[PDB]
């Protein structure tokens, strides 16, 4: 399947995707404002994401930080970003259909747009300025919104025994956001899309 990748952010971010153990494509790359990269992902791929990056410092060998979304000091992922991260989810060609979804699970740091460019589903955007909004105890000082689990680690907020009900936190998100995950148990709000669809993935898709 393609994804294309495009910032339309005002300022640098700095792409990733991966599935958790292993990179997909290059595993990332620098966008800035208004570039555009274009991935290959295998079909049969099961729990990929895509997310930013803000406020990286890489050196030449790929090695360096990220204020949020860091993937343990590389440019080029291999394993899932540090919170807080907007994330685009993936599971593609799962008998015959693929599922997307935008979860704020692990917090929000740019707003998203993830859309098909091919027929037959719609997309889904997390758009609002959940930053500028943010409950003081969530707030990031190195820029974005934490979830509550990252923040205060009970079971209540990482749904730890599979029984856990919404909270204030992930009520936020979901006022502000409804058609992205606010929390593990949370009504879905994946979308059903053909088998071997392709996709966009914009950051600040209203800026």
Same mark, same amino acid.
């Given at each position: 399947?393609?994804?294309?990748?495009?910032?339309?952010?005002?300022? *640098? @971010?700095?792409?990733?995707?991966?599935?958790?153990?292993?990179?997909?494509?290059?595993?990332?790359?620098?966008?800035?404002?208004?570039?555009?990269?274009?991935?290959? @992902?295998? &079909?049969?791929?099961?729990?990929?994401?895509?997310?930013?990056?803000? $406020?990286?410092?890489? $050196?030449?060998?790929?090695?360096?930080?990220?204020?949020?979304? $860091?993937?343990?000091?590389?440019?080029?992922?291999?394993?899932?970003?540090? &919170?807080? *991260?907007?994330?685009?989810?993936?599971?593609?060609?799962?008998?015959?259909?693929?599922?997307?979804?935008?979860?704020?699970?692990?917090?929000?740091?740019?707003?998203?747009?993830?859309?098909?460019?091919?027929?037959?589903?719609?997309? @889904?955007?997390?758009?609002?300025?959940?930053?500028?909004?943010?409950?003081?105890?969530?707030?990031? &000082?190195?820029?974005?919104?934490? $979830?509550?689990?990252?923040?205060?680690?009970?079971?209540?907020?990482?749904?730890?025994?599979?029984?856990?009900?919404?909270?204030?936190?992930?009520?936020?998100?979901?006022?502000?956001?409804?058609?992205?995950?606010?929390?593990?148990?949370?009504?879905?709000?994946?979308? *059903?899309?053909?088998?071997?669809?392709?996709?966009? @993935?914009?950051?600040? &898709?209203?800026?």
């Amino acid at each position: 399947a393609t994804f294309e990748i495009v910032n339309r952010c005002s300022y *640098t @971010v700095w792409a990733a995707a991966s599935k958790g153990d292993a990179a997909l494509d290059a595993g990332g790359r620098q966008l800035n404002s208004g570039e555009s990269w274009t991935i290959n @992902v295998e &079909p049969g791929t099961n729990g990929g994401k895509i997310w930013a990056r803000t $406020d990286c410092y890489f $050196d030449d060998s790929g090695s360096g930080i990220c204020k949020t979304g $860091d993937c343990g000091g590389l440019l080029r992922c291999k394993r899932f970003g540090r &919170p807080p *991260t907007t994330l685009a989810e993936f599971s593609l060609n799962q008998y015959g259909k693929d599922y997307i979804d935008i979860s704020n699970i692990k917090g929000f740091n740019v707003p998203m747009n993830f859309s098909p460019t091919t027929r037959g589903c719609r997309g @889904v955007r997390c758009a609002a300025d959940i930053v500028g909004q943010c409950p003081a105890k969530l707030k990031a &000082p190195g820029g974005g919104c934490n $979830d509550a689990c990252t923040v205060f680690q009970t079971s209540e907020y990482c749904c730890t025994t599979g029984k856990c009900g919404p909270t204030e936190y992930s009520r936020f998100f979901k006022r502000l956001c409804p058609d992205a995950f606010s929390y593990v148990l949370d009504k879905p709000t994946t979308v *059903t899309c053909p088998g071997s669809s392709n996709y966009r @993935v914009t950051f600040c &898709p209203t800026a």
